[PDB]
Amino acid sequence: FQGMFFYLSKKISIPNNVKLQCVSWNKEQGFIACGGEDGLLKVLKLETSNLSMNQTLEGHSGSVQVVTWNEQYQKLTTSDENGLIIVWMLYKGSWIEEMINNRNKSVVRSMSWNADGQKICIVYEDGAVIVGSVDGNRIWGKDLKGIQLSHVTWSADSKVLLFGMANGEIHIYDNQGNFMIKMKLSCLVNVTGAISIAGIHWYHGTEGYVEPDCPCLAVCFDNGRCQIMRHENDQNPVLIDTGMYVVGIQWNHMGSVLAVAGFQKAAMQDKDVNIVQFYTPFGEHLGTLKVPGKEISALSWEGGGLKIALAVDSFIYFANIRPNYKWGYCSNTVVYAYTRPDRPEYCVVFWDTKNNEKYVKYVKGLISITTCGDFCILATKADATFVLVLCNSIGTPLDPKYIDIVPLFVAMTKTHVIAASKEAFYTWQYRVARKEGRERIYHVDDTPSGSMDGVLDYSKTIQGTRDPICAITASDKILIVGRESGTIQRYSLPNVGLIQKYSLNCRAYQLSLNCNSSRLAIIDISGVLTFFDLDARVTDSTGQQVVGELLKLERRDVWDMKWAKDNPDLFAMMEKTRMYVFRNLDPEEPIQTSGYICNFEDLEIKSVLLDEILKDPEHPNKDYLINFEIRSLRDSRALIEKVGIKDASQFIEDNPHPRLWRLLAEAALQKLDLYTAEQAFVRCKDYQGIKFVKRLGKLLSESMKQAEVVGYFGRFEEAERTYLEMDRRDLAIGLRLKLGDWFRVLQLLKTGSGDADDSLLEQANNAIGDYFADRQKWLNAVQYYVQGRNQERLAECYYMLEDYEGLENLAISLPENHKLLPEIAQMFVRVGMCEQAVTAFLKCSQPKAAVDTCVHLNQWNKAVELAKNHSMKEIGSLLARYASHLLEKNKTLDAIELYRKANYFFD
Amino acid sequence: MRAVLTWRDKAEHCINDIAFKPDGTQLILAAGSRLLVYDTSDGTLLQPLKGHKDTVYCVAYAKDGKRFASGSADKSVIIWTSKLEGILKYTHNDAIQCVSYNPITHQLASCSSSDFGLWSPEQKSVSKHKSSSKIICCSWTNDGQYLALGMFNGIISIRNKNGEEKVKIERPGGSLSPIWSICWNPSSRWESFWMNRENXXXXXXDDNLEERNDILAVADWGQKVSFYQLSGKQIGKDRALNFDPCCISYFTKGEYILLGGSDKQVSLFTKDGVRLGTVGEQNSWVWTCQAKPDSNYVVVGCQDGTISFYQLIFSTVHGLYKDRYAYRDSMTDVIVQHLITEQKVRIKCKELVKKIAIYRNRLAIQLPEKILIYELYSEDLSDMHYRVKEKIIKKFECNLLVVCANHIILCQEKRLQCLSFSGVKEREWQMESLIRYIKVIGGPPGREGLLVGLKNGQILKIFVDNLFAIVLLKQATAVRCLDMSASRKKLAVVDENDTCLVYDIDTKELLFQEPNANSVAWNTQCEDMLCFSGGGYLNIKASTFPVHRQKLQGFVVGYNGSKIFCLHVFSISAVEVPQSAPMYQYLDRKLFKEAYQIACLGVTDTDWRELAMEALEGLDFETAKKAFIRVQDLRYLELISSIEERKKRGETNNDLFLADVFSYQGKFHEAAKLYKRSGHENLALEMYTDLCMFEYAKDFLG
Question: Which body tissues produce this protein (chain B)?
Answer without folding.
Answer: Expressed in many tissues. Predominant expression in testis and pituitary.
